[model samples]
Target: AQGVAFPISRDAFQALEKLSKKQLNYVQLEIDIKNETIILANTENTELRDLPKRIPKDSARYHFFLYKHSHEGDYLESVVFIYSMPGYTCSIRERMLYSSCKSPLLEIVERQLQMDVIRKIEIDNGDELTADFLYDEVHPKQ
Candidate 1:
């Protein structure tokens, strides 16, 4: 058989399940280029106001951020997939791999977790990671 494609680890799948259940606000993920597997980099529990603290400024990672909000009196939540890459610090190889893996990995999470993500945002820093920033993304004006 040929070489395998990029695959997420078993525990990463478990973390996705937990994320779907709203067990926490965000789950940080990383890719092992050597192994070509997605790993559970970290997890964080915080309000939307404090969630930006979870993202490091000098690394490339996937942050699955979930938020609960009201929709005309309905209490629902959204999964905001943040593809954060600090281009100034990451190697070109690191940046490219992370970028290429993003789309497919996102589809895997939504499919397996059975959760629909309202928005996907790519950022170089958390300076724009404000509640208002995400609110506008998910709630676009007509």
Candidate 2:
């Protein structure tokens, strides 16, 4: 139940295959923007919530690492890769861990975060599209 593939697009499936063939492990998802290409982070067994540590502030690597701290956990050799959709692409890495394979961090973010943004309002105000700006502030790293 924990080690399972969630529903993803066909393109994603192929990209994941590529990573698997290459025997890569660990994938970091860019939570900032949806695009036609994704980059792979060299980090391994990184906790999904600890992602803020990887984001390099005031640098191109900012989007690369969204976490600010290293989580205490074991790293697993997982398949990771990026693929393009109609207008977006993402990198995915996989690994086996001691904890449940399912990512609780992702589930909490989706469930508790008030992420609704008024699309039409932004259109009227001539604002650029942004996902982070729409979400409430989580916290500032100490």
Candidate 3:
């Protein structure tokens, strides 16, 4: 893989299936054949923390990483956004945000995290395309 690769572990895959069934958020993997890498992104939410680590780093020996930050809630401030590059060797967050909360609200966080995963993939891959001009030579119906 030249650019990146998104290899989902059993745990992470199960977690994502659970979230998708609950209508939290959706997850998809995009592979850029030209770049010889993969990208994963989460959108809408971002509370997922451990989901990324569940992925095996050996799946792709490029550089895995994660990007996370806290977003404000009505009564509390919690981290909600997360982006992971499986081979990018990025962020260092272990536990998912509010993973212990056994409440409906926690479900919402899970949904957001699902979205975060998808978004991260989009952003990272787009950056690579732009930096390398992956789309520069592609001609449209002109």
Candidate 4:
């Protein structure tokens, strides 16, 4: 028998599901390597709406992590979103193991996060969405 590995704790998983659904409107991932913490900038509203003030500065008790990355032109390169236990061990393999067990939850969060990004881009460019724009810029073909 292949031994056993404990992934994220059940309590942590439940907390992530609860908080993400309840609090995440426009979430941003802040990787604080120096502090060994992954901060989820969870908020009830978009960033342009003064939502930062609504986020408590000391709410670090939550623990769970989901990870994703993207690279585009000069604007964004190697942007990583890490949602996980606060101060989670920074081992890439451990993070992967935990995420592997929570793909469904991760996917839900990813979809929301992607939409948030698109909203920001649309606002910044003031450009309406079109098939060509999505294909050529947003969801480029491989």
Candidate 5:
């Protein structure tokens, strides 16, 4: 269901509507399974606030469109923001699309996650980290 579209509830609709006015190139929403919360993030430099909202449990996919207001003829094409469960997995696709548009936030998050993973490996092994070690940890042979 990666490319599928699912229905969103009224509450979810309204929650997204609140963001429509903002000047955004793209937005990504993820369900934080560990925290039991939904994280809404975008290309804008807005501070993240915790919102414990759930889309319909039966919904396996969701999407939202972004538009540029000043353009007379939808100058900015609608970038579809897709959502899915198992939140961590959701971020990968979103990051790819956002990164293509040169979203700095996604780049920062990617670097932070990479460094954090490397640091964790260093702590677990109690060894001086090496470039090969970082590469191996960062790009696991799956």
Candidate 6:
């Protein structure tokens, strides 16, 4: 269900499909309020190890990370959803829009899009998305 205020573009379907159907490090996305569609807005990509390198602090974003790791000898794999909203820097209106719009995108990611996401994360800055941070997120100690 693409939220009316935030709809998914046809191209987004293909991109997300390709991402999940294949193997990739990380994919970044942004919303086009002018066109009102969610699309693959990142000009480039990431390798996950140093995935926390660059994230614009002036705008909110969506990120899907293909998490692949061997935790204490056991392999772990999953697509992690990230809502990167720079609360302190980004505009309040933009933040509210994204907050309302996120649910619909998530719906499209999970139920409508049929993606295999194991975890959902929310962060206000790039510094929080660390290897150690995510390792703990994906494989918590019992």
Clashing pairs in 6: none
Q: Show the lowest summed lDDT stretch of 10 residues, model 2.
A: 117-126
Ranking by lDDT: 1, 6, 4, 5, 3, 2
lDDT of 4: 0.33
- The candidate 1 region of ten consecutive residues with least summed lDDT is 1-10
lDDT (Cα atoms) of all candidates against the true structure: 0.75, 0.27, 0.31, 0.33, 0.33, 0.72
**What TM-score number comes out for model 4?**
0.25
Candidate 3, lDDT over the whole model: 0.31
Residue runs of model 6 more than 4 Å from their true location after superposition: 1-5, 70-73, 140-142
Candidate 6: global Cα-lDDT? 0.72
> Could you give the C-alpha RMSD of every candidate to the true structure, in order shown?
2.9, 15.2, 15.7, 12.2, 16.1, 2.9
Clashes of each: 0, 18, 28, 7, 0, 0
Candidate 1 off by > 4 Å: 1-5
lDDT of 2 at 17: 40
User: Please, what are the lDDT tens digits per residue for candidate 2 over residues 32-137?
Assistant: 2233222333445444344344433222220111212122475323221111111122123211210121243223223433222121111111122133432212
Q: Which one wins by lDDT: 1 or 5?
A: 1
lDDT of 4 by residue, 112-135 (tens): 333222211221121222334333
TM-score of each: 0.85, 0.21, 0.21, 0.25, 0.24, 0.80
Off by over 4 Å in 2: 1-39, 62-142
By summed lDDT, the worst window of 10 consecutive residues in model 3 runs over 93-102
TM-score, cand. 1: 0.85
lDDT of 6 by residue, 62-87 (tens): 77777767856797777788788766
Alpha-carbon runs more than 4 Å astray in model 3? 1-22, 26-28, 34-50, 59-81, 86-142
lDDT score, candidate 5, position 124: 20
User: Which one wins by lDDT: 4 or 6?
Assistant: 6
